[PDB]
């Protein structure tokens, strides 16, 4: 299924702060009824966290550093199905602008796919973006059947 990440913690762990991490710490805490863990360790941004190892966690948190370092293992392996799914809805994406797309919509793969097909669509004539979305949906997101419609009624 799909973890609830917090919103403010929705973005990727790689550019997560040092608010960002405690504030995970907080939440899984709560969610996953770990033991209560101190957060003046990992003291550190999320490029930091990601370079822990289990036996890292584990030495901040001898009670829950094992399930912390599996919840972000879940996390990232999370992510990655997000941008594949986003590579395989909009060909020639790169990695980089599907992780960048993900972002702009809080982690919603539909949405983060939608908005890289109206961009595309949107430069192909003066109209809005209502409208650009408008035409999308209804060819169903099919950018080619809405790129044709755009072509012929510019
Ligand atoms: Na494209």
Redesign the pocket.
């Known amino acids: 299924h799909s973890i609830r990440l917090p919103a403010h913690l929705r973005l990727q762990p790689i550019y997560w702060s040092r608010d960002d991490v405690a504030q995970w710490l907080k939440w899984a805490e709560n969610e996953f009824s770990l033991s209560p863990i101190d957060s003046n360790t990992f003291e550190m941004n999320g490029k930091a966290l990601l370079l822990l190892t289990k036996e890292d966690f584990r030495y901040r948190s001898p009670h829950s550093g094992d399930e912390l370092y599996e919840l972000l293992q879940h996390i990232l392996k999370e992510v990655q199905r997000k941008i594949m799914e986003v590579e395989l809805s ?4 790169t990695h980089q602008e599907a992780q960048t797309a993900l972002g702009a919509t809080g982690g919603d793969v539909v949405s983060a796919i939608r908005n ?1 097909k109206v961009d ?1 669509l949107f430069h192909l004539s003066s109209r809005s973006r209502a409208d650009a979305w408008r035409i999308l949906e209804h060819y169903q997101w099919d950018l080619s059947a809405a790129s044709r419609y755009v072509l012929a009624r510019p």
Do not use: A, E, F
């Open positions: 909009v060909h020639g994406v890289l595309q």
